[PDB]
Scaffold this active site. Structure first.
Site, PDB file in Angstrom:
ATOM      1  N   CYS A   7     -29.199  51.523 -30.584  1.00 29.05           N
ATOM      2  CA  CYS A   7     -28.263  51.196 -31.636  1.00 29.05           C
ATOM      3  C   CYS A   7     -28.177  51.560 -33.044  1.00 29.05           C
ATOM      4  O   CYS A   7     -29.165  51.451 -33.507  1.00 29.05           O
ATOM      5  CB  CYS A   7     -27.366  49.797 -31.049  1.00 29.05           C
ATOM      6  SG  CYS A   7     -25.898  49.412 -32.006  1.00 29.05           S
ATOM      7  N   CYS A  56     -27.370  49.493 -36.019  1.00 25.01           N
ATOM      8  CA  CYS A  56     -29.032  48.335 -35.654  1.00 25.01           C
ATOM      9  C   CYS A  56     -29.465  49.143 -37.107  1.00 25.01           C
ATOM     10  O   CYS A  56     -30.528  48.238 -37.312  1.00 25.01           O
ATOM     11  CB  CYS A  56     -29.254  47.696 -34.737  1.00 25.01           C
ATOM     12  SG  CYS A  56     -28.330  46.963 -34.035  1.00 25.01           S
TER      13      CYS A  56
END
EC number: 1.8.-.-
Lengths: 38, 789, 43, 114, 49
Positions: free
Chosen positions: D37, D40
């Site tokens: 992600c 992230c």
């Protein structure tokens, strides 16, 4: 000896003169290039 | 894989390998030592090898002029007789110099770096001499062995110019009979018609397709048999010749392998020192284990003679933060070039580069970066193109330029195996620091590298407006900035020290720099605390952004001379400190400056601010380069750097342009430059910055007249770096005597330094027992006057 | 060798029976001529 | 000794049940990142900075939703980057935040809501 | 000095028909590469083109 090796290709190596169907430009190549560079 | 490696990592991983195995490897070869009477025996118990840390820290060793070194101890058995005549004392074997983390060894107070050596790779190679098919084994000791065919096979192994023997005779001397040859070669009736180290083993197995187990580290006779069989292959043309000059056939010896070799020498000296002291013990009795029958001299003086004398151990070029890094990545054929940014020395001494792998649907790879040497990467279709092409066909059949074998060719993406994704992949550190490098003639890429390696750190260093993004990597890996060693909150900051507290533990970090952290800042482990000399904000900062015009002034910028404003003297802009005591060296006439593009010049003139050309905003330009240099060295990239630097000065933007941005889009660099020039114009309401009639150029005015120069001048704020700073020759003798100006020639060759050197000439020939006798004949009297010789 | 290049857009016209067929150094078919040949370009 | 480069500690879901059931002196921040992600990458750096700034005054931990996906779903996580702030007092409701909230919002929550 | 010989990004001046000429040389090369895959043209002719 050409014909003995032709036989050896047929019997052992599995050769056959399978006919090649060529586009007319590939045939022209496979003919014209027999005669020279230009 | 995922990121640009640490530049010193090649040294670091080498040194750790030397510690992780080279010590065991070299100590394991230390033999049992036996006395002359075959009654007393000594051995090192290599399993007890123990490096105790340096009792003197680096900053003390450099101050005291000492070597920063760990001490190797090993326990040593000595049976002075049968039964209990045994001691097994732990003995000091000697100092090994430890590497400091940025990749250097302090030796007798002076930082040294071990330059990497390039050698011909071990293995087997075939040369077509003049056809004379010539096989050659190279062992990793550098030992050749040669095999040859000139006609009708009858393969000779060659040992010397007067020593050739047929390979069946050699194999018979190696104990292999004609039945083994017949069994173990592909063309045995051809043979019958005649009637290396781990790297070497790998490369001979690979090149001959052999499957000899790796534990057969030495040459086997069957290796020579396979070499002769492949040589018959070459004779028929069932193979290829090998090009020795190609980078695929080279290996790199690092600090690890040279230090390990020097441990081998040091232990062979230790062997002679034990044998001789055991002699003195077996003739004078003396005392058992005084420490032991070992002195510290062999290792300590072996390593210190290696560093003092070996051509591949060189004083660290501490000139600027870039050269401290680049020096440890040199690659010398003696005992040159430099390693590419992403290059890695593999476990077999090959130089490996990362390539993204396009495995399509079948396999479930986790990491899709391969590392491949130039030996492997030729057997893959590497593309450098982009997937940004589409047609009424499909992306897979879209063709791109690729590389396969040594050829360049155009192939469909469906055929491509690997992609060279990283921009910097092929560049050295110096070349990677050049923006718009794809717009500069590659011939000058070396020169423009060298220029940055001559740049003096400046007082009040300054970040470049235009860069490539590697100034960060260079600053980080140079070790000139104080990187934090431990996370924590800052406690205190001054010119002398930084203090951290974290994990409820304090750390004090003295500065040998200016603090970038505020006293209230909080810091993660490896973040910058303080900038060094010629860094700002943790970017390399070798130069200053000088407002510049390129126009031919009245000859004072003739053929890359340069005019500067007096403001460059006012502002300390190019003031350096040179330490001997220090001197505040200002910029002067005859000083050398260069841009990063190889646009070097020498300051010829310093003009007061009001005599300079001045812009339509009234600002005088601070240097006037000459534009005839631009097509002379073919560096259009600097004009981009000029224009976009101006944009960056007006927008308050820095730019970090990775090379080959033209891969996105054609004219991509021109589009970036003109876009940011137009933004700087319309934001600042400076319409002269982007004049649409001739973008990037502007009309500028003579400060001594106020009239405009009638054609637009290219203007910029490029990043300029200040660079660091009698034989009478035979061709001068030829020139002077060509002018017939022979009394000057006489002066230059005689009384400025028969002549006494002719006296030396005659005296040395007279010492060879030849009388060089000089006579002159009187025109008046025919008397043979002997000259004073 | 010099290259003759079309100075104008248009239609090439010539009697191709006057010239011998050949394969070019690049494999392209071409005509090889050993005469002064006049080629029209209907622009 | 070489000091470890990262402070935010990865937990399994069971080690997290243990850490939530046992008594706590300090706020517990649980990050439900996942490694594919994009946000992230940024949240992991913000949380590393938070984990330094608070030292032992906060327990900041992370749970890879590649491994603990069903636990993330049971935590009512509906996206990543997501973060729970669990009070040391077990009576108080925990706070779930979604998206890259500012590090100053993390400090606000930890100082004023936990 | 009264003039100037300054060089700019659009003082350089790529011959305008270069694009067409490159497209020409590109299209021929693509066709030949296609016909090289078809086996109408051997590797030496493709290299020489």
């Amino acid at each position: 000896t050409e014909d003995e090796a032709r036989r050896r290709n047929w019997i052992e190596r599995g050769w056959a003169p399978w006919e090649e169907i060529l586009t007319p430009e590939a045939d022209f190549a496979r003919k014209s290039l027999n005669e020279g560079e230009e | 894989t995922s990121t640009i490696p640490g530049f010193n990592q090649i040294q670091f991983e080498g040194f750790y390998r030397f510690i992780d195995q080279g010590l065991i490897e070299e100590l394991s070869k230390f033999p049992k030592i036996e006395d002359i009477d075959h009654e007393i025996e000594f051995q090192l118990f290599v399993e007890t090898y123990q490096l105790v840390e340096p009792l003197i820290k680096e900053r003390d060793a450099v101050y005291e002029s000492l070597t920063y070194s760990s001490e190797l101890y090993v326990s040593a058995g000595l049976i002075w007789k049968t039964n209990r005549n045994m001691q097994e004392q732990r003995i000091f074997i000697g100092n090994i110099p430890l590497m400091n983390s940025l990749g250097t060894s302090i030796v007798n107070g002076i930082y040294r770096v071990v330059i990497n050596q390039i050698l011909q790779s071990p293995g087997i190679y075939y040369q077509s001499e003049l056809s004379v098919y010539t096989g050659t084994i190279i062992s990793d000791w550098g030992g050749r062995l040669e095999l040859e065919i000139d006609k009708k096979a009858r393969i000779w192994a060659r040992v010397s110019r007067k020593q050739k023997i047929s390979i069946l005779v050699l194999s018979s001397a190696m104990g292999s009979n004609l039945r083994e040859i017949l069994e173990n070669v592909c063309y045995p009736e051809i043979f019958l018609s005649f009637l290396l180290g781990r790297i070497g083993r790998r490369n001979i197995n690979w090149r001959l397709n052999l499957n000899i187990p790796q534990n057969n580290i030495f040459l086997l006779p069957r290796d020579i048999l396979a070499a002769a069989d492949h040589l018959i292959g070459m004779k028929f043309g069932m193979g290829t010749l090998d090009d020795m000059n190609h980078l695929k056939n080279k290996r790199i010896r690092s600090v690890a392998d040279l230090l390990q070799d020097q441990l081998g020498l040091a232990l062979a000296r230790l062997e002679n020192v034990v044998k001789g002291t055991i002699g003195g013990a077996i003739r004078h009795k003396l005392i058992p284990t005084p420490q032991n029958l070992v002195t510290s001299t062999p290792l300590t003086t072996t390593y210190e003679s290696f560093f003092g004398l070996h051509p591949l151990s060189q004083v660290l070029d501490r000139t600027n933060p870039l050269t401290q890094i680049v020096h440890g990545r040199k690659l010398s054929y003696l005992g040159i070039g430099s390693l590419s940014i992403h290059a890695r020395i593999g476990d077999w001494g090959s130089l490996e580069s990362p390539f993204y792998e396009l495995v399509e649907k079948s396999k479930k790879a986790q990491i899709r970066m391969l590392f491949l040497s130039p030996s492997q990467d030729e057997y893959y279709m590497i593309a450098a193109g982009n997937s940004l092409a589409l047609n009424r066909g499909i992306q897979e059949e879209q063709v791109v330029p690729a590389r396969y074998r040594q050829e360049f060719l155009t192939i469909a993406w469906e055929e491509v195996h690997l992609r060279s994704i990283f921009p910097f992949q092929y560049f050295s550190i110096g070349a990677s620091l050049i923006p718009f490098i794809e717009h500069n003639d590659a011939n000058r890429a070396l020169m423009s590298s060298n220029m940055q390696r001559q740049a003096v750190p400046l007082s009040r260093s300054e970040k470049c407006i235009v860069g490539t993004g590697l100034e960060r990597q260079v600053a980080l890996d140079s070790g000139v900035p104080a990187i934090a060693e431990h996370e924590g909150k800052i406690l205190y900051t001054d010119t002398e020290k930084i203090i951290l507290s974290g994990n409820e533990n304090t750390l004090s970090i003295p500065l040998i720099q200016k603090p970038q952290v505020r006293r209230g800042k909080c810091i993660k482990k490896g973040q910058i605390l303080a900038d060094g000399a010629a860094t700002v904000g943790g970017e390399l900062a070798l130069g200053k952004n000088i407002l510049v015009a390129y126009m031919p002034w009245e000859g004072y910028n003739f053929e890359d001379a340069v005019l500067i404003s007096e403001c460059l003297v006012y502002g300390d802009i190019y003031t350096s400190f040179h330490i001997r005591i220090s001197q505040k060296r200002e910029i002067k006439v005859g000083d050398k400056v260069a841009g990063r593009h190889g646009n070097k010049g020498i300051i010829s003139k310093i003009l007061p601010r009001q005599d300079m050309p001045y812009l339509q905003d009234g600002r005088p330009v601070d240097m006037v380069f000459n534009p005839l240099g631009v097509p002379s060295r073919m560096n259009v990239g600097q004009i981009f750097e000029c224009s976009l630097g101006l944009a960056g000065s007006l927008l308050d933007r820095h730019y970090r342009i990775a090379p080959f941005d033209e891969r996105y889009e054609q004219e991509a660099s021109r589009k970036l430059v003109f876009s940011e020039l137009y933004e700087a114009s319309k934001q600042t309401a400076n319409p002269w910055v982007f004049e649409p009639e001739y973008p990037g150029k502007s009309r500028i005015f003579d400060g001594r007249t106020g009239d405009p120069f009638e054609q637009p001048v290219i203007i910029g704020k490029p990043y300029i770096l200040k660079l660091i700073h009698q034989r009478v020759g035979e061709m001068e003798v030829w020139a002077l005597e060509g002018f017939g100006v022979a009394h000057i020639l006489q002066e230059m060759l005689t009384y400025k330094s028969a002549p006494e050197s002719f006296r030396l000439l005659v005296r040395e020939l007279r010492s060879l027992a030849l009388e060089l006798n000089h006579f002159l004949v009187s025109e008046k009297n025919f008397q043979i006057n002997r000259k004073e010789v | 060798a010099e290259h003759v290049r079309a100075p104008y857009n248009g239609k090439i016209k010539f009697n191709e029976d006057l010239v011998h067929p050949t394969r070019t150094r690049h494999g392209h078919p071409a005509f090889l001529c050993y005469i002064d040949l006049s080629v029209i370009i209907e622009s | 000794f070489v000091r470890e480069d990262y402070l935010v500690r990865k937990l399994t879901a069971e080690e997290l049940q243990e850490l939530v059931k046992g008594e706590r002196k300090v706020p517990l921040i649980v990050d439900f990142y996942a490694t594919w992600c994009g946000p992230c990458i940024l949240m992991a750096q913000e949380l590393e900075m938070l984990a330094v700034e608070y030292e032992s005054n906060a327990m900041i931990v992370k749970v890879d939703t590649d491994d603990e996906y069903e636990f993330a779903r049971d935590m009512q996580v509906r996206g990543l980057p997501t973060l729970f702030f669990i009070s040391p007092d077990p009576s108080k409701d925990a706070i779930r935040t979604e998206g890259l909230i500012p590090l100053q919002m993390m400090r606000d929550i930890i100082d004023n809501d936990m | 000095t009264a003039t100037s010989i300054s060089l700019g990004i659009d003082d350089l001046l790529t011959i305008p028909s270069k694009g067409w000429l490159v497209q020409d040389a590109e299209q021929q090369s693509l066709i030949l590469e296609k016909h090289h895959h078809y086996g109408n043209v051997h590797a030496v002719e493709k290299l020489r083109q």
